[PDB]
Amino acid sequence: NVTLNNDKISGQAWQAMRDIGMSRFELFNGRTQKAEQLAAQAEKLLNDDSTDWNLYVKSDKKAPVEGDHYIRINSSITVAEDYLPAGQKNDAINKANQKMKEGDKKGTIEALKLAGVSVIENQELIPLQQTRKDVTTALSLMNEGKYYQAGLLLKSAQDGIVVDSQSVQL
Amino acid sequence: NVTLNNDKISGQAWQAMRDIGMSRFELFNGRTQKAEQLAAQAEKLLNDDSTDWNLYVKSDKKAPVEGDHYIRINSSITVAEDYLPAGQKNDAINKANQKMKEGDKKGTIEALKLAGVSVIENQELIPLQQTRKDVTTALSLMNEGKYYQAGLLLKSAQDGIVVDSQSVQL
Amino acid sequence: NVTLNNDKISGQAWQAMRDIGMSRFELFNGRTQKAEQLAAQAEKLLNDDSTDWNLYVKSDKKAPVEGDHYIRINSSITVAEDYLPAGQKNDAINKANQKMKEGDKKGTIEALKLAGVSVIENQELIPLQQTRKDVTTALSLMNEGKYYQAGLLLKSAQDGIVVDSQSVQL
Amino acid sequence: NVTLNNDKISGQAWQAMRDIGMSRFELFNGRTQKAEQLAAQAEKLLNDDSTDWNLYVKSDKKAPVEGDHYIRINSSITVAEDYLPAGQKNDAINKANQKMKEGDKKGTIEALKLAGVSVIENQELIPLQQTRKDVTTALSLMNEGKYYQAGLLLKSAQDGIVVDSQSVQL
Ligand SMILES: [Cl-]
Ligand SMILES: [Cl-]
Ligand SMILES: [Cl-]
Ligand SMILES: [Cl-]
Ligand SMILES: [Cl-]
Ligand SMILES: [Cl-]
Ligand SMILES: [Cl-]
Ligand SMILES: [Cl-]
Ligand SMILES: [Cl-]
Ligand SMILES: [Cl-]
Ligand SMILES: [Cl-]
Ligand SMILES: [Cl-]
Ligand SMILES: [Cl-]
Ligand SMILES: [Cl-]
Ligand SMILES: [Cl-]
Ligand SMILES: [Cl-]
Ligand code: NA
Ligand code: NA
Ligand code: NA
Ligand code: NA
């Protein structure tokens, strides 16, 4: 999948983060072997050598750990609707719908502005190498029987998700 | 998957909510046919006649719409750690790790209490019929070309996700 | 302030949680004496002997720590809007506005239902004694110079905030 | 208050956003005159002519509406803790505590890195003029008796809050 500006989003890393959360839950749920399976899947997803990880990097954002980079894992939309009289907004929304039908992203943004609607794109990001290290280290702790400590690292990986909300500039 | 109390969680409905969010994004991304495909997948997941939806119902929670019910779609954990001197907490955490290894949920909760750690389970819920109606109606609006209005219903479905955070009573 | 069902909400505890967050930030901001001042204010707010803390208790919710109770610190609204043709919804919303003008909460909920709008009340809660202990212990750690450890307890207090989202049953 | 880089944060705008949320709740709570009072307070806070609003602007972030700017209303911290053996981390945390005592922000960040801890600063931002317009227009709608529509604009103002999470570069 791609952002509004056509930059690639990592579905593998999104699924890895989902697996990380499920893994942590299974530690507390008394299913530590299931937790290891889920963390192992996350490790394979984040370290896939056939994936070109450069494609997902948000270059304009400094990661906390030296040499690391944030990658895009999801995009969503926030709209902000100004008050308009019912009639004027219907006609403006109808034109916005035509641009979406046409695949015209810029025309959609501009028609929505005439409807009093601003658009913000929320890009969910993770630091790639820091997340990889959390997963691999958590698995090592699980191998050692240090399950609570593994859970702390899985939670830290989740807490490293950030959301860059930006106005749409196509 | 199951909660700490062994109640079933709907992976299909979780994926349906993921599909609903992606569908809404694709409307703004100028890919309305992709949005319809994603909403159609969500509709099939939420309306699977081979699924016994009773298994996922949280019976002790009144849904906003008459006749409806909330279903469980995810569980996560929140811990709250009291301050303990480094030595006393290590020994208590080590015993908690043994109970997790043993699959002993109650023993895990009790050992964590000795470590100064309380456990809260966060159950993500959706109203099943209200969400079904949002998806089916959004698809109908997409068929009619009313894409912005479909996006509003998809967002409403997402805003209907609630999180019941409860202390663990096994 | 009060919930939709006229149960009291603690403005003091809300401000205490705000102070707890600011206190934690000031630790990292190199202003540990400011952090102590903010945590001391939170302690005074949560332990005010002139406040009748029973007024804010959500009795139908078991707190994680034995003998403790959750108290209400905020209420907000989530609406869920069904799709209605523009004309029918305007007339229904106009009637909802009259009930709000009249102070008629039940009539507002019922008029909104005719407009295709369901209402959910989100009650933010904290465990009172567990939060008190976090604050007092964090101050003690600050007195000892253990600032990072104090920050962990302040964060734990914040992570103990839960949101009970319930359909409106007046 | 100030960020880690000593940029000013608007306490007035933070309180305005708090007032906006309370105002919206009071509409549904059948207290429309209280909602107007709270929105009027938010309007006065955001439009204070004695405040130098330039002090709070995050210049490196484009606001959705032409001519507008994002302003800082809060800062918080996220830590990410690597796994370290208990002994090595205690000694590293003890040195971090000394730098916080000394007010040495850069030394704190560097000592925390030796403890395996990365620091992210989360800056809560609002678009100033777009938020002002939401509040003033919502009050006008309240004067007209269009309470539900006012609530939509108050919610839109809240949905315009974004969080810029950045690694600490002092
Ligand atoms: Cl297992
Ligand atoms: Cl890379
Ligand atoms: Cl580093
Ligand atoms: Cl290890
Ligand atoms: Cl398409
Ligand atoms: Cl059912
Ligand atoms: Cl109903
Ligand atoms: Cl329809
Ligand atoms: Cl200070
Ligand atoms: Cl009490
Ligand atoms: Cl207890
Ligand atoms: Cl102590
Ligand atoms: Cl009033
Ligand atoms: Cl300005
Ligand atoms: Cl504009
Ligand atoms: Cl107006
Ligand atoms: Na979206
Ligand atoms: Na979890
Ligand atoms: Na509200
Ligand atoms: Na903070």
Author numbering:
A (entry chain A), B (entry chain A), C (entry chain A), D (entry chain A): 18 to 187
From the article:
Rectangular crystals (space group F222) diffracted to the resolution of 1.4 Å were obtained in a crystallization condition with pH 4.6 (Crystal I), implying that this crystal might consist of the st_YfdX tetramer. Its asymmetric unit contains a single st_YfdX molecule that is composed of six α-helices, one 310-helix, and three β-strands. One 310-helix is located in the middle of the α2–β1 loop. Of note, we figured out that a tetramer-shaped oligomeric form of st_YfdX is shown in our crystal lattice, which can be fairly well-matched to that of kp_YfdX. In contrast, we could not find any crystallographic evidence for the formation of a st_YfdX trimer in our structure. We next structurally analyzed the intermolecular binding between st_YfdX monomers in the tetrameric form. The two st_YfdX molecules designated as Mol A and Mol B in Figure 3 interact with each other mainly through very tight hydrophobic contacts. Hydrophobic interactions provide additional force for the complex formation between Mol A and Mol C, which are mediated by Tyr100 and Ile137 from one molecule and Pro81′′, Tyr87′′, Leu158′′, Leu170′′, Val179′′, and the hydrocarbon part of Thr154′′, Lys163′′, and Gln166′′ from the opposite molecule (right). Overall, the interaction between Mol A and Mol B mainly depends on tight hydrophobic interaction and appears to be tight and dense, whereas that between Mol A and Mol C is maintained by the combination of hydrogen bonds and loose hydrophobic interaction but seems to be relatively weak and detachable.
